[PDB]
Design a binder for these strands. Structure first.
Lengths: 196, 128
RNA sequence: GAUCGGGUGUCCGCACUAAGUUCGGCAUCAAUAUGGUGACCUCCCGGGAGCGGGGGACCACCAGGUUGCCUAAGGAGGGGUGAACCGGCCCAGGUCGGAA
């Protein structure tokens, strides 16, 4: 019976931690620091000294309504690093492969969190938000990889989820979702235009 | 290209084909403010809030060419297109622009739509 | 405005959380096309020796084009030692082949 507003959290964090003027390095640093503090406070050290053992959060552990933030912050860090590499690669063509490597892995965390959301412990509001976030990330990855057929469908699914949520909620609460869909609308138009 | 305007230093728009794609409410006013006060000089910098904007100056006839594309990445053919359209304008419409008085500019009508569309088609074919 | 109500910090050897400073330890991937360097192996053609010319199999490394069934990550980043003679290059003298 625990709810989470991933879009509200990320919107509040980006505009406060350097992305108001568009500085992704500070945002990536903030994401790393926040994940470090979250793990230190929640006592979720993946590895001890001189040993590392990667462990995934199971269905029972999410009772604190905070372990999802770990996956969210990992996805945010990967996406921010990829976005910074996007602007950096205009001079060095080599950075495109690194950007693709980061983007192909951010969707992994997105899909893992959307699968973790399947449990009955969480409410039905976070599931659709996780699905929309995963669709958004997948569409951006496939748009960067010059794949239009899958990107347009992912964008349409994400827009359908966002429009349904905005219609369900009141006008004041739906301004964030309206801005979110209007941000991705030009990407949808360009994806539809690339085929010609 | 999704937005393109050719207006004089006197604040009068000569020709545009924005259409339903874009509305020129305040996309060029911010650029004017940046040029007058900030003195950008950053090689077509200062995307305003949602789409990248680039400009080119013509001190010989007191003219400015503005081209606006989406914030998505675009190829470098835009600057070549701007140079070509500016040179075509200077070659053909020289009679009106060379005159200092704005009465001739007001009286003259420019049917540049077809030529600009052909240039855009050439640029898109090169881009593809 | 007479009593009167009490709600909130200056005080804490107090506990937790959000945002940042500072100091240590560990580790920092690979396939593929092309050219190059260094060892080792193998085909040859010529010659009285030192030897000259051409072709291959395999390993290590650098510049670098498209990549991934790659991870918590793995840049085509920079510097130094390079040792006892064991990375080779150009190699003084000396040394061996040859009248040169």
């Amino acid at each position: 019976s625990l709810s989470l507003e991933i879009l509200q959290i990320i919107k509040e964090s980006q505009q406060q931690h350097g992305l108001r003027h568009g500085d992704f390095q500070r945002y990536r640093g903030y994401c790393s620091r926040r994940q470090r503090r979250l793990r230190k406070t929640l006592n979720f050290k993946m590895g001890n000294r001189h040993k590392f053992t990667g462990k995934k959060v199971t269905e029972e552990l999410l009772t604190d309504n905070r372990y999802l933030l770990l996956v969210l912050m990992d996805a945010e860090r990967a996406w921010s690093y990829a976005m910074q590499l996007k602007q950096e690669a205009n001079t060095e063509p080599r950075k495109r492969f690194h950007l693709l490597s980061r983007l192909r892995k951010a969707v992994k965390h997105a899909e893992e969190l959307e699968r973790l959301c399947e449990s009955n412990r969480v409410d039905a509001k976070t599931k659709l938000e996780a699905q929309a976030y995963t669709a958004y990330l997948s569409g951006m990855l496939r748009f960067e990889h010059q794949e239009w057929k899958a990107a347009i469908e992912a964008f349409n699914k994400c827009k359908t989820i966002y429009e349904k949520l905005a219609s369900a909620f009141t006008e004041e609460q739906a301004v964030l979702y309206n801005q979110r869909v209007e941000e991705i609308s030009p990407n949808i138009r360009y994806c539809a235009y690339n085929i010609g | 290209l999704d937005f393109f305007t050719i207006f004089s230093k006197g604040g009068l728009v000569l020709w545009c084909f924005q259409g339903v794609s874009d509305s020129c409410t305040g996309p060029v006013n911010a650029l004017i403010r940046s040029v007058l006060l900030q003195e950008r000089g950053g090689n077509n910098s200062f995307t305003h809030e949602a789409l990248t904007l680039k400009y080119k100056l013509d001190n010989q006839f007191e003219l400015v060419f503005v081209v606006g594309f989406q914030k998505i990445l675009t190829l470098t053919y835009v600057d070549k297109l701007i140079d070509d359209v500016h040179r075509l304008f200077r070659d053909k419409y020289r009679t009106e622009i060379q005159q200092q008085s704005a009465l001739s500019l007001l009286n003259g009508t420019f049917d540049f739509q077809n030529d600009f569309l052909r240039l855009l088609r050439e640029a898109e074919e090169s881009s593809k």
